[PDB]
Design a protein around this nucleic acid. Structure first.
Lengths: 99, 83, 56, 68
DNA sequence: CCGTCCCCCGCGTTTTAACCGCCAAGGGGATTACCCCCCAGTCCCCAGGCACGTGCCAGATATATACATCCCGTACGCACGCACATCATTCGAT
DNA sequence: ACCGAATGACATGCATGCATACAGGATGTATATACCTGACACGTGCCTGGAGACTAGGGAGTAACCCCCTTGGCGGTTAAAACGCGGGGGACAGC
């Protein structure tokens, strides 16, 4: 009885929405907890200055987004629609970080 | 019968050899053209800078060190020829 | 100029970074100088690959 | 040596070329070409093909960022 | 998975144009000399810019409503094959 | 070989597939409206640092010379480029 959108019909909408928008997407609290967790190994009981943490968030998403858009192309180059990890390895390979 | 653009002086087999050194097995015919253009593009940048250092030094002669300096700018250092 | 122009073109009179990103990435000549740096809260340019479009 | 003299003539006129400076361009271009070649295979094999076509060499030069 | 071709591949000619080896000229790169004129160094100084306050504004921010759009169903055409009777062929009788 | 009975071909009846256009109707989006104030815009200090004027002494810019190494040319061979082609297996499309 209720209407259903076709597969992918919804998905493209968020595409349009999110590229228009310019705010962060990761949950704020866990990200600050995670960076504390990893940084614990290099040095004990360091204090993260409050403004510094979101900078890591901003760069990370920017760095992350660049990955997927690049991995997107090769999937099309592979005549596919869905990405699987082998693409990211290739993309990381070509730029020269994984290798 | 050599009076033309010297880009075609880059013979097709010479390309075929380089693909081998990169491990390329099979090459389609259409590769030989953009490879010319792509290589052509590469020279445009490097000499422009290479010219620049020379004329800044007022020198009319392009010297070897001028080459490596420009190559260093593009993030491709060159060991073996000075500096 | 480009940022102030475009923000006005979006019916807004206060310049904000989302406007600022749009100008840089839309002009290839400046895109060369600022291809490396990314700007805080920049936001991605609206773009969708053609093959991703609906089948009809 | 003819090719470099031809292109250089556009940027400026009357450039005597030091002999030592010459072979550098080949080696720099060679490795650049060689490096630009190998990764193209990975792009090619990724699509399960064996032969490389120019649409790949264009794709590869994009992922590095140099295409733009 | 299947298939399908064609378009690169090896391979044989064979042309030549690099490659060599040698000879020559002189431009010009490299080196020296002179120096002046040019930027760093000081002292004084004074106003430009910065720190702090301050509000007003509009920029926002929220409201409700109209509109644009998408998907599914609907209907409807149509051209269709299947099915059918009929037309035409065939085996037997003539 | 034409006449019947029978049957295959011919012609169309019947049902269906499929396409297509629509209209609905739902939903999301754009409009359309008030209030709101964090928050830009001054505005006022207040001083320090940029400018003015000063001398001093070296580094850049000149002339001047040189020689080599770049450029030019100039045959000889021949290795490599150019060409033809026969074909098979790699691309590629489709289920």
């Amino acid at each position: 009885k209720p209407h259903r959108y076709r597969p992918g019909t919804v998905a493209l909408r968020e595409i349009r929405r999110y590229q228009k928008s310019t705010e962060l997407l990761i949950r704020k609290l866990p990200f600050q907890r995670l960076v504390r967790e990893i940084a614990q190994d290099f040095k004990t009981d360091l204090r993260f200055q409050s403004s510094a943490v979101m900078a890591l968030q901003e760069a990370s998403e920017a760095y992350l987004v660049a990955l997927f858009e690049d991995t997107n192309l090769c999937a099309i180059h592979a005549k596919r629609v869905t990405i699987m990890p082998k693409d990211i390895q290739l993309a990381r390979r070509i730029r020269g970080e994984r290798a | 019968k050599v009076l033309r653009d010297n880009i075609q002086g880059i013979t097709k087999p010479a390309i075929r050899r380089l693909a081998r050194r990169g491990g390329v097995k099979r090459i389609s015919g259409l590769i030989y053209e953009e490879t010319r253009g792509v290589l052509k593009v590469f020279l445009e940048n490097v000499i422009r800078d290479a010219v620049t250092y020379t004329e800044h030094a007022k020198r009319k002669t392009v010297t070897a060190m001028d080459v490596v300096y420009a190559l260093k700018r593009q993030g491709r250092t060159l060991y073996g020829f000075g500096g | 100029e480009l940022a102030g122009n475009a923000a006005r073109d979006n019916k807004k009179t206060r310049i904000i970074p989302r406007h600022l990103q749009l100008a840089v990435r839309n002009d290839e000549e400046l895109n060369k100088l600022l291809g490396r740096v990314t700007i805080a809260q920049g936001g991605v340019l609206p773009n969708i690959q053609s093959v991703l479009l609906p089948k009809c």
